[PDB]
Paper text:
Drosophila melanogaster α-amylase, DMA, which belongs to the glycoside hydrolase family 13, sub family 15, has been studied from an evolutionary, biochemical, and structural point of view. Indeed, plant produced inhibitors are an important element of the plant defense response to insect predation against feeding. α-Amylases (α-1,4-glucan-4-glucanohydrolase, EC 3.2.1.1) belong to the glycoside hydrolase family 13 (GH13) as classified in the CAZy database, and catalyze the hydrolysis of starch and related α-1,4-linked glycosyl polysaccharides. As reported for other α-amylases from mammals, insect, plants, fungi, archaea and bacterial α-amylases, the enzyme consists of three distinct domains, A (residues 1 to 97 and 160 to 379), B (residues 98 to 159) and C (residues 380 to 476). In DMA, the nucleophile is Asp186, the general acid/base catalyst Glu223 and the transition state stabilizer is Asp288.
Author numbering: 1 to 476
The structure:
């Protein structure tokens, strides 16, 4: 429940938010695999309610557990999981079993229907007996209300009923049979850990035909928003699996926006209120808070603030704490709008420019060189500890990961032009933020490390990027 089941030498779980299964399978073979990424978090794979204008959040209103969505059907999903596993990229499913669709959700994405007004969902065989008595959540200081009442009108399932446990376990086991590596448990805060323990403990072992070692169990990351001041703490879940560490997203946004100083990053980790490193999924933003949903912090950094977004992403990917998840978005100016479509309904596949960047309504942050090259950085440094920490007491910092990678940041309003200790072997390195190693040369900036380990590091405050990174797997 705690091991990611990543393949060897890989890091980074990309949330391919609202992507179709066929497009993910291609992306695994064309990009994610060859660029050392470790996994893909998919949108909910089960049938959801069809809502007017097809908002993104319609997928969090389950109608059945049949694998029929705007992303594809079961055959397309199964083929994607196989094709992704074959190139070393794992699949993690956003599973939604706190609730069923709310009132108005009559039609499902796979042809099923439902009567949420009567709590009747004939696709899951669900009836009103399978739900908690109707009430609304308002007081997050009442743990009983948070877990037993309806979240924004979504019909609240009773996971204490053995029939509901059976239906959920059957659904998750089915996904395991198809080769998934783990699950992102939606609204875990709104369910009782005792019931989740029963569901988690019943899941079968992972499918060894997809390359998982014998005895492997599903990775469990639980969506628990714990900013403090409420009745439910993330510590109620860290014994059953990992948790979504939203303090990381909030703090890293404040720090790299300039609301806090980079010099304080010297004790990044539990000293900032985070859960344990081996229990924390970290991210710069997620599909909720990039949109003002969920925690909804205005200091969250998104692709819309690109320079500081890449700096925070680079710091996350360079830092040993936690398990990083890399957001991948579609462009939006409305917090309800769904993914791009060809006709208002059919999701439009991403298209690619001459430089392999995304277009057609998709951002593909995972295809930004400053981000995927930092995945390569993370892969090169392994488990090496932070060394050679330096800062100017404000917003200029640098450090190495052992003797294998070095990173430097400038968030001050003046230039950084300093000889810094990199801890790396002497030689000529390609800055992987501004470019890549290509043959025996660099496409962007070059960094020369002398015999004493020091190098001239130059990051102008007005440059497009405010981070520089070098590592031994991009050395001339
Ligand atoms: Cl999440
Ligand atoms: Sr509940
Ligand atoms: Sr200091």
């Amino acid at each position: 429940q705690f091991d990611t089941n990543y393949a060897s030498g890989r890091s980074g779980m990309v949330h391919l938010f609202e992507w179709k299964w066929d497009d993910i399978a291609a992306e695994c073979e064309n990009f994610l695999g060859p660029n050392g990424y470790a996994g893909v978090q998919v949108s909910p794979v089960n049938e959801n309610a069809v809502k007017d204008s097809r908002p993104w959040w319609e997928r969090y209103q389950p109608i059945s557990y049949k694998l029929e969505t705007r992303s594809g059907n079961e055959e397309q999903f199964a083929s994607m999981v196989k094709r992704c596993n074959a190139v070393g990229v794992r699949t993690y499913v956003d599973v939604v079993f706190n609730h069923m669709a709310a009132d108005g959700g009559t039609y499902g994405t796979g042809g099923s229907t439902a009567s949420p007004s009567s709590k009747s969902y004939p696709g899951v065989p669900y009836s009103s007996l399978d739900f908690n008595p109707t009430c609304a959540i308002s007081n997050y200081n009442d743990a009983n209300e948070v877990r037993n009442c309806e979240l924004v009108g979504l019909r609240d399932l009773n996971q204490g009923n053995s029939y509901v446990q059976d239906k959920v376990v059957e659904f998750l086991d089915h996904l395991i049979d198809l080769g998934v590596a783990g699950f992102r448990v939606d609204a875990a805060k709104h369910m009782w850990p005792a019931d989740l323990a029963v569901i988690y403990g019943r899941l079968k072992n992972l499918n060894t035909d997809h390359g998982f070692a014998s005895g492997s169990k599903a990775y469990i990351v639980q969506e628990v928003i714990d900013m403090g001041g409420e009745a439910i703490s993330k510590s109620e879940y860290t014994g059953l699996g990992a948790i979504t560490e939203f303090r990381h997203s909030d703090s890293i946004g404040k720090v790299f926006r300039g609301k806090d100083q980079l010099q304080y990053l010297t004790n990044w980790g539990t000293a900032w209120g985070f859960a344990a490193s081996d229990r924390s999924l970290v991210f710069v933003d997620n599909h909720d808070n990039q949109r003002g949903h969920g925690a909804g912090g205005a200091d969250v950094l998104t692709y819309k603030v690109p320079k500081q977004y890449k700096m925070a992403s680079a710091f996350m990917l360079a830092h040993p704490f936690g398990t990083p998840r890399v957001m991948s978005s579609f462009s939006f100016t409305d917090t309800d709008q769904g993914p791009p479509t060809t006709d208002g309904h059919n999701i439009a596949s991403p298209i690619f420019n001459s430089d392999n960047s995304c277009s057609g309504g998709w951002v593909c942050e995972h295809r930004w060189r400053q981000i995927y090259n930092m995945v390569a950085f993370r892969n090169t440094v392994g488990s090496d500890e932070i060394q050679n920490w330096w800062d100017n007491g404000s917003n200029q910092i640098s450090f190495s990961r052992g003797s294998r990678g070095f990173v430097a940041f400038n968030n001050d309003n003046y230039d950084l032009n300093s000889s810094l200790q990199t801890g790396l072997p002497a030689g000529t390195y390609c800055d992987v933020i501004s470019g890549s190693k290509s043959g025996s040369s660099c496409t962007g900036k070059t960094v020369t490390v002398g015999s004493d380990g020091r190098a001239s590091i130059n990051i102008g405050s007005s440059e497009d990027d405010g981070v520089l990174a070098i590592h031994v797997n991009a050395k001339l």
